[PDB]
A = this chain, B = another copy of it.
């Protein structure tokens, strides 16, 4: 945690008040009545959105019964409540887009229905999140509102519906818009202003506690609501400045190098929601309060590009899937905002030759913003170019590639990272995007997943990462079990780190240097060690999949998904192949039926020594 306070340094409440844009004059979309401008903006989205709206003309708004909320306490079931809720929010979002597209009033009745139904609900908070209320129950309490992920998005959607359709709504019956204003005030504006203690706001934050994607996600939704619904400038400045102080906590907490250490699967709602917040803040201040030019924000956006190997494969240190992806439209908008050509070309690449269409779902801001970017994203040339080395020195992630299709990810770090695996010093090797030396990634949660016994799960253990068992001992969990002297020579493509301190006293190791050198054709892996005492033989493990063969002593071949490599290992080792049948669908959906651990074992025992391994395409 670093006190950068970038937003507070850019403006105080007095500065803010002088630059806030009132009366929603900041809104970038045409007036609902401006049919020609909607037709130009919409392009080929028009007919698609209209057709999606037509499918909802007889949509029956779904009631959520008390028992669906109660079921969270009874069994932990979330989906019983979330499925009808999300169906409603998606319908309302789609109807908004359809009515903007067509402008004939055909969807207005259903928009009005959705809005009115939404006001009658006691709360927009998810059943799993309601237990943070005073009563600690999973059922709404009509006397109290909190804000969660769902309710903020629900609120923002309602605010946009209100903004676009207030006039046709009031023609039908002005009480609808009136109740919408009341609902948004009670469920977003007031709780946001009056309750300093919502955990995601991080006003009470201290070391040890978590700040995560909830912070920019909830702040960006609240910010939209205020900018759309709060017409008192004094009240608006106070709310906006509060949001700036809150989001500063998030910016202060993440690393300046821009690596999202949970991995790419959170990126869209972490860095991507920080982007949304900053765009919204910029729009609301006529561009005068903008961090979109800050290099750290660009690095946070570019992490999604650098970490995306290809064909759905992503770098997956820690408890993260080896499969991933992104919203190309979001990535494009983020890229353009921070002037990252790399991100803009990457977004075009991720389209996979699809034409960009409006983002549907239930996120009103991203749906509307997707309309603005489509035409430009459509013209963008697809390319996934990046430097041969990306070095995140604080997070200690290192990506290194060559022009013949090898991509190596390596890490230093410490065994108390977010979603930690005991993996200090590990590497992953991809060949033409295909994992060849892999990192197994994320399994289904069990009771053992959190707490002592986390490290009894094989996916979390150094034993099942691309690492040694020093004197036969694996790495230990803990903040102080860490890399030392981690370096990256960007020009030579050499990553090096001393992993000795990631192992417990029983490992009896003074130093162990693990280094990776990538040349134009091969990856050289070296170990260089000094032990206090030679207790037991070292073991070295590699994780892989596909078709594994052993043509001769010192040689392994791996053939997987059209790629083929040879791994040369010291002949002092006896190589065995362990089959890991994958019962857990979260794993088998990525890797198929089984993966392998290659074990390299020896009878040797010495206080010093070194190993070289070489991997090349064949």
Contacts and interface: CB of A to CB of B under 8 A. Distances in A.
Given A120-B120, A120-B122, A122-B120, A66 B176 contact: yes
B172 A70 contact: yes
A109 interface: yes
Interface in A157-190: 172-173, 175-176, 179, 182
Contacts of A109: 67, 70
Contact of A175 (B61, B120, B141, B172): B141
A175 B121 contact: no
A116 B182 contact: no
Interface string A123-155: 000000000000101011111000000000000
Copies in the complex: 2
Contacts of A141: 175
A198 interface: no
Interface in A53-108: 60-63, 65-67, 70
Interface residues of A, number: 30
A113 interface: yes
Contacts of A61: 63, 65
Instruction: Identify the 10 closest CB pairs spanning chains A and B, nearest first.
Output: A66-B116, A65-B113, A63-B63, A141-B175, A120-B120, A66-B113, A67-B109, A139-B173, A142-B179, A66-B112
Given A63-B60, A109-B67, A112-B66, A175 B117 contact: no
A137 B60 contact: no
A614 interface: no
Contacts of A60: 63
A175 B142 contact: yes
A119 B122 CA distance: 9
6 contacts: A60-B63, A66-B117, A67-B112, A67-B113, A70-B109, A119-B122
Contact of A135 (B175, B176, B179): B175
Contacts of A67: 109, 112-113
A117 B173 contact: no
Contacts of A173: 66, 70, 137, 139
A173 B179 CA distance: 27
Nearest to A175: B141
A124 to B, nearest CB: 13
B176 A117 contact: no
A117 B63 contact: yes
